[PDB]
Amino acid sequence: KIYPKLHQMDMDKVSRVYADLRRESISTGSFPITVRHLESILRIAESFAKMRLSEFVSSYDLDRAIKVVVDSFVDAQKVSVRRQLRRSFAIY
Amino acid sequence: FRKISRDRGIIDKIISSMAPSIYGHRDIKTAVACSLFGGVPKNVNGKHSIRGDINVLLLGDPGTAKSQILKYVEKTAHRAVFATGQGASAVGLTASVRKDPITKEWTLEGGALVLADKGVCLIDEFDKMNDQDRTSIHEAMEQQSISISKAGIVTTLQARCSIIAAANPNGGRYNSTLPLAQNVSLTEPILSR
Amino acid sequence: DNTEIIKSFKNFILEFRLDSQFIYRDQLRNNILVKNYSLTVNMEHLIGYNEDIYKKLSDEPSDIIPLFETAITQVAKRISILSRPTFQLILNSNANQIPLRDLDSEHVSKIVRLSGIIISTSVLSSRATYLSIMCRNCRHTTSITTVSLPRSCLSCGPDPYIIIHESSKFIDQQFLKLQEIPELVPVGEMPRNLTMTCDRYLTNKVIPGTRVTIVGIYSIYNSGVAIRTPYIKILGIQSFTEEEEEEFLQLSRNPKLYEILTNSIAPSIFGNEDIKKAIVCLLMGGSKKILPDGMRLRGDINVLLLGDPGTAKSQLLKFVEKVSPIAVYTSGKGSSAAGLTASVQRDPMTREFYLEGGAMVLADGGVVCIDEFDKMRDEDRVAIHEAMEQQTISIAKAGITTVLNSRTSVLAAANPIYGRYDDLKSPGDNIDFQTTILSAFDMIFIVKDDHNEERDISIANHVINIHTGNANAMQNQQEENGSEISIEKMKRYITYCRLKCAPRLSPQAAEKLSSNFVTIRKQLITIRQLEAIIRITESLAKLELSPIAQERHVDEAIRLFQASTMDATSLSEIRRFEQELKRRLPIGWSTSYQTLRREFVDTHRFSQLALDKALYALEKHETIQLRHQGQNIYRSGV
Amino acid sequence: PSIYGHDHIKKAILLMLMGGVEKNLENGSHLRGDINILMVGDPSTAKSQLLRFVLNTASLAIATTGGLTAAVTTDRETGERRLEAGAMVLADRGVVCIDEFDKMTDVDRVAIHEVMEQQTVTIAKAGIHTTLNARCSVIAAANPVFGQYDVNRDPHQNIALPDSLLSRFDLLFVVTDDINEIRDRSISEHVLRTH
Ligand SMILES: Nc1ncnc2c1ncn2[C@@H]1O[C@H](COP(=O)(O)OP(=O)(O)O)[C@@H](O)[C@H]1O
Ligand SMILES: Nc1ncnc2c1ncn2[C@@H]1O[C@H](COP(=O)(O)OP(=O)(O)O)[C@@H](O)[C@H]1O
Ligand SMILES: [Zn+2]
């Protein structure tokens, strides 16, 4: 029954996260971060919204989505770089 | 349902509800729940389409319940199909060819991915399956469909399912000092799906 | 009673007048002079001449078509006698065709009209049309014209008669397999096949893969409790509105048509303009030519997508499969040489071995989309070599050998090995298949997805706009503005362009191509590449419906060729820059692009074009390596 | 006439067509007289055209590519079987044209060793043993794996065929499209006239 719709209220909060992930993947052996991984943030935000049965994608849903995707990317890097990327993405 | 929906912070209850007997691993349980609920298959303007389901890979050392989680998705989702890496075949997963006992004509029968349509497909020990059976999953992971050309039969079936995969790292133990792209026998294409 | 029907047919043949001429009488007389015992009757004239006989034919043709045959035979014999065998009825019609899936138990013995593609044809069979028989008991003779021999003599025991072979006549018959167009088949369904039969002059007119229009009779025959096999008695085989023509001509007259169509290919994807234009060229396709020795130049344009994963390479093929009027999409893993190409299989309905076309045979005259091309077996690739380069498929199975033509354009998306295409390596080392395949495709595109700040932000903005649903309104407004073409209208335009025009090159375009290819050859790719580039400009001229190919097409064709194949006296200046850099940069040292700019170009020691070309050549010559998008340059060798 | 230059290859083809003279000795020995030619280099470069001319010009030219051994039986509809002739045997007193010679199997190589050396075929099969004359001249074309010939090395490393097989060819020629812009223009103007 539930099909949440999107609004462009938080375009920057997703675009800057995508840019940050791409920048951090430029020179390290890591996930093949591409547009397909950008779509994962949107789809998992939709899934979070669909738990509340809300008809719209809110800022909180996008916050949790960004948290999950960024944590998944970070927790897979090597030890020496992990403790640096812990602080590089302290915003999220 | 609407009584439940109004509770503040419902997301945390849902996340804690996945596989209660498994301790910890909250970062995995959240992904399992998100894949169970899924997203919106936005067929934008018809001429363009996006897959609506979330694909999850469980990679880790032995003794981390990467397998028994699938024994919860199989018992929770409405329609779930479970397969083992070496106990599966490329023909068996996608589609098999049959000759009709009445009309003697070439006919096609759907495989596990066709059966799991509008559901979820589970592949355990995803790393140890042979390369060809792993390759057979490529189209299903993004197109949510099976394209085939055998014995003159040319058709495409709907395979709208999410994939949950569990695997072990190279050597059987994860080397924390080495990147992910070195700890597994898989490749960047497969990881990108 | 039937004498009136015969008289009406006689009038409709002898006395019917159209365009102030006895068109039917004249055409039958011409056929008699040619000695072709067949008459092509147009149903649209028959309905206009007499409606009652048309009603009888439409409702109960079972006795009408024997009447047609005998009346046509008699009238043609009268015409032959006037000027100095049983004549075959051929029906031409333009009425609405019932879909194949809509055929039911209600259209039994009714004449219907169909359209579809031929997938298999049988060998010819000899059937009796006139017999003379003799009784073995008493040598009594008689003639007989489903037919079965008499049980008793007319003068002897049961079944006394035997056939007099030297006083009988026979005719040929062929069995055909028709199926609905796969483009009209929704996903999740195998296209329905249909059995058709033709005889005498209607045999051998089609081969598997041929798209035809049918006029025939729906009927059944016995070969499940009561599953009687349906089959079609073939009666006639045939194989844009004026306002639509004007609309598409105005679309051709659009001064921005090329860019409009370029944007129209997958508007829901960002950038990728070069591959978009290349796919446009593939959709138009080249122009066919025939050598004076009889060989045919393959006009199909085959493009290999050879980039990093997740670069919308699959989405492009899936979009083309929507757009192209004839399109086949299949995965490399789920296909086989026997499935992609033709095969010989036994028909259980007629108990005979049939030559059956494959997926690439079905895509004859169209485009096939294949994915995970690197994952198919080598034998399939060998067959695809023949399909691509000779437009033919060779079959040698059981105890029969045959060659079948296939004019199929192939668009292949392949994943380079090691997952990521390493720029430190030759393309041969980043590939796992036969090297000669690189000599088969006309162009390859090694697309890269190097991380960038602003470009990724713009792409993210586009994707968020798409997920927001604003893209729908934006596309609608662009279509209203004429800047974007609807997918159905685009397909109609492509079909119109394919069917109508066939350009040819001009001397001005050829000379520049020769000069540029000479420069490329001297710098180094074979002579085949120059002839392959001709396909791109022919395709562009087809897009513009121009009578000839033009150099202004050749410019963009050369740009695409350079940005596709080269993905991995000025030459004297370039090599002098190489020498000066070898003196300037010792082995193992590092520098930056901007440093070289400031020290050599701002000092006007060398030009910026010389800088770029020398860096490119030195990187290919393993002398230097470019790192971090030009922020670091390292000399890897001498 | 369709090839510019390559005078030595044409001379070799003419001499091979002319051939030598066979001899017989009081000891029963026989001496080979025929000549073989092998072509090596980049695939599309002029090998196909020369082979086409040789096949079309010679009166007894048989084209071969990777049943040539003539040691296989074809069965009738009633069940009985008969041997089928092979190209190496049918080309007796003729010439054999081979394209994609590198792609031929090892069985073909071990069979053609005797064809090129002793001009005969020794058939040894279950219940069938016979000797057939194979007095045929051989012209073949082969291509490297990389597609581009390494002019600094012999075909023993570019194509890696056995040395015993290569030594049975009396003449060998290597051609590769080393581009000289004016000469390529002169030769390709005829091709352009066909476009
Ligand atoms: N995080 C956990 N919490 C509770 N029990 C666990 C956990 N991880 C593993 N187990 C126990 O260990 C077993 C792991 O089984 P399995 O899923 O095959 O391990 P893996 O797939 O990680 O090799 C399960 O039976 C489960 O009871
Ligand atoms: N330029 C782009 N604009 C919009 N979407 C894009 C773009 N590039 C990639 N994508 C996204 O990537 C997906 C296609 O990935 P695909 O090419 O199928 O992966 P793979 O290369 O592994 O087959 C689509 O869902 C599409 O939304
Ligand atoms: Zn009798």
PDB file of C-alpha atoms in Angstrom, chain B residues 42-50 90 99 102-108 131-133 135-136 138-139 142-143 145 147-158 187-189 192-193, chain C residues 187-191 193 224 268 309 313-315 318-319 328-331 333-336 339-340 345 348-349 356 359 362 371-372 375 377 415 418-420 466-467 472 475 479 484 487:
ATOM      1  CA  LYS B  42       9.980   4.146 -10.114  1.00  0.00           C
ATOM      2  CA  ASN B  43       9.179   3.411 -13.757  1.00  0.00           C
ATOM      3  CA  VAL B  44       9.749   7.088 -14.538  1.00  0.00           C
ATOM      4  CA  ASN B  45       7.637   8.079 -17.562  1.00  0.00           C
ATOM      5  CA  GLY B  46       7.538   4.386 -18.501  1.00  0.00           C
ATOM      6  CA  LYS B  47      10.551   4.752 -20.806  1.00  0.00           C
ATOM      7  CA  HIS B  48      12.950   4.549 -17.842  1.00  0.00           C
ATOM      8  CA  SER B  49      13.036   2.198 -14.877  1.00  0.00           C
ATOM      9  CA  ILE B  50      14.858   1.799 -11.570  1.00  0.00           C
ATOM     10  CA  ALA B  90      23.113 -21.405 -14.111  1.00  0.00           C
ATOM     11  CA  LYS B  99       9.488 -30.351 -24.183  1.00  0.00           C
ATOM     12  CA  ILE B 102       1.233 -33.115 -25.173  1.00  0.00           C
ATOM     13  CA  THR B 103       2.321 -30.804 -27.997  1.00  0.00           C
ATOM     14  CA  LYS B 104       5.998 -31.932 -28.086  1.00  0.00           C
ATOM     15  CA  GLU B 105       6.972 -28.262 -28.452  1.00  0.00           C
ATOM     16  CA  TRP B 106       9.919 -26.462 -26.905  1.00  0.00           C
ATOM     17  CA  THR B 107       8.744 -24.892 -23.652  1.00  0.00           C
ATOM     18  CA  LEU B 108      10.466 -22.940 -20.905  1.00  0.00           C
ATOM     19  CA  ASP B 131      32.181 -18.429 -11.899  1.00  0.00           C
ATOM     20  CA  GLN B 132      29.502 -19.236 -14.488  1.00  0.00           C
ATOM     21  CA  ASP B 133      26.698 -19.673 -11.951  1.00  0.00           C
ATOM     22  CA  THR B 135      27.729 -14.742 -13.840  1.00  0.00           C
ATOM     23  CA  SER B 136      24.158 -15.966 -14.379  1.00  0.00           C
ATOM     24  CA  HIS B 138      24.360 -10.438 -13.355  1.00  0.00           C
ATOM     25  CA  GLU B 139      21.213  -9.582 -15.311  1.00  0.00           C
ATOM     26  CA  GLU B 142      19.838  -5.017 -11.974  1.00  0.00           C
ATOM     27  CA  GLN B 143      17.261  -5.756 -14.677  1.00  0.00           C
ATOM     28  CA  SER B 145      14.538 -10.136 -15.350  1.00  0.00           C
ATOM     29  CA  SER B 147      16.831 -13.047 -20.777  1.00  0.00           C
ATOM     30  CA  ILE B 148      17.364 -16.362 -22.546  1.00  0.00           C
ATOM     31  CA  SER B 149      17.849 -17.830 -26.032  1.00  0.00           C
ATOM     32  CA  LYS B 150      17.760 -21.635 -26.066  1.00  0.00           C
ATOM     33  CA  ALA B 151      16.344 -24.113 -28.596  1.00  0.00           C
ATOM     34  CA  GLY B 152      14.764 -21.255 -30.541  1.00  0.00           C
ATOM     35  CA  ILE B 153      12.959 -19.879 -27.478  1.00  0.00           C
ATOM     36  CA  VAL B 154      13.617 -16.138 -27.172  1.00  0.00           C
ATOM     37  CA  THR B 155      11.878 -14.456 -24.242  1.00  0.00           C
ATOM     38  CA  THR B 156      12.373 -12.462 -21.053  1.00  0.00           C
ATOM     39  CA  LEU B 157      10.763 -13.283 -17.709  1.00  0.00           C
ATOM     40  CA  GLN B 158      10.145 -11.043 -14.722  1.00  0.00           C
ATOM     41  CA  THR B 187      35.184  -8.411  -8.564  1.00  0.00           C
ATOM     42  CA  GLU B 188      34.158  -4.765  -8.691  1.00  0.00           C
ATOM     43  CA  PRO B 189      31.320  -5.379 -11.224  1.00  0.00           C
ATOM     44  CA  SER B 192      28.573  -2.722  -7.842  1.00  0.00           C
ATOM     45  CA  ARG B 193      25.245  -4.570  -8.100  1.00  0.00           C
TER      46      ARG B 193
ATOM     47  CA  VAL C 187       7.760  -9.559 -21.406  1.00  0.00           C
ATOM     48  CA  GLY C 188       6.957 -12.807 -19.625  1.00  0.00           C
ATOM     49  CA  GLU C 189       5.592 -14.546 -22.726  1.00  0.00           C
ATOM     50  CA  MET C 190       6.993 -16.682 -25.536  1.00  0.00           C
ATOM     51  CA  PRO C 191       5.739 -15.479 -28.945  1.00  0.00           C
ATOM     52  CA  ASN C 193       3.929 -19.739 -33.410  1.00  0.00           C
ATOM     53  CA  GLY C 224      -4.195 -33.947 -25.659  1.00  0.00           C
ATOM     54  CA  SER C 268      16.727  10.360 -18.182  1.00  0.00           C
ATOM     55  CA  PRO C 309      30.812  -1.072 -14.240  1.00  0.00           C
ATOM     56  CA  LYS C 313      26.107   0.894 -20.111  1.00  0.00           C
ATOM     57  CA  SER C 314      23.277  -1.624 -19.671  1.00  0.00           C
ATOM     58  CA  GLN C 315      20.621   1.092 -19.509  1.00  0.00           C
ATOM     59  CA  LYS C 318      17.764  -1.501 -22.678  1.00  0.00           C
ATOM     60  CA  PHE C 319      16.628   1.904 -23.967  1.00  0.00           C
ATOM     61  CA  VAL C 328      16.265  -8.277 -29.619  1.00  0.00           C
ATOM     62  CA  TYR C 329      17.733  -8.246 -26.111  1.00  0.00           C
ATOM     63  CA  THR C 330      19.426 -11.285 -24.586  1.00  0.00           C
ATOM     64  CA  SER C 331      22.190 -11.980 -22.096  1.00  0.00           C
ATOM     65  CA  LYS C 333      25.179 -16.193 -20.326  1.00  0.00           C
ATOM     66  CA  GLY C 334      21.625 -17.261 -21.194  1.00  0.00           C
ATOM     67  CA  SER C 335      22.257 -17.701 -24.920  1.00  0.00           C
ATOM     68  CA  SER C 336      23.952 -20.235 -27.173  1.00  0.00           C
ATOM     69  CA  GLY C 339      19.942 -20.197 -30.014  1.00  0.00           C
ATOM     70  CA  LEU C 340      21.576 -16.984 -31.188  1.00  0.00           C
ATOM     71  CA  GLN C 345      15.037 -28.995 -35.634  1.00  0.00           C
ATOM     72  CA  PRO C 348       6.442 -32.674 -34.642  1.00  0.00           C
ATOM     73  CA  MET C 349       3.352 -31.431 -36.499  1.00  0.00           C
ATOM     74  CA  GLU C 356      14.796 -22.797 -37.758  1.00  0.00           C
ATOM     75  CA  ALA C 359      17.765 -14.858 -32.166  1.00  0.00           C
ATOM     76  CA  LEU C 362      15.053 -12.810 -35.981  1.00  0.00           C
ATOM     77  CA  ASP C 371      25.022  -7.982 -22.413  1.00  0.00           C
ATOM     78  CA  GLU C 372      27.832  -9.739 -20.556  1.00  0.00           C
ATOM     79  CA  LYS C 375      30.954 -14.229 -20.663  1.00  0.00           C
ATOM     80  CA  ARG C 377      31.648 -19.166 -25.028  1.00  0.00           C
ATOM     81  CA  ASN C 415      33.009  -5.755 -18.840  1.00  0.00           C
ATOM     82  CA  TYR C 418      40.142  -7.116 -13.471  1.00  0.00           C
ATOM     83  CA  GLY C 419      36.851  -5.235 -13.050  1.00  0.00           C
ATOM     84  CA  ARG C 420      38.402  -1.809 -13.597  1.00  0.00           C
ATOM     85  CA  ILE C 466      14.474  12.328 -11.642  1.00  0.00           C
ATOM     86  CA  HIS C 467      13.468  10.669  -8.367  1.00  0.00           C
ATOM     87  CA  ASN C 472       8.359  13.966 -16.178  1.00  0.00           C
ATOM     88  CA  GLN C 475      10.465  16.109 -20.500  1.00  0.00           C
ATOM     89  CA  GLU C 479       8.672  17.759 -26.055  1.00  0.00           C
ATOM     90  CA  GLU C 484      12.838  16.290 -27.295  1.00  0.00           C
ATOM     91  CA  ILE C 487       9.919   7.497 -28.064  1.00  0.00           C
TER      92      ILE C 487
END
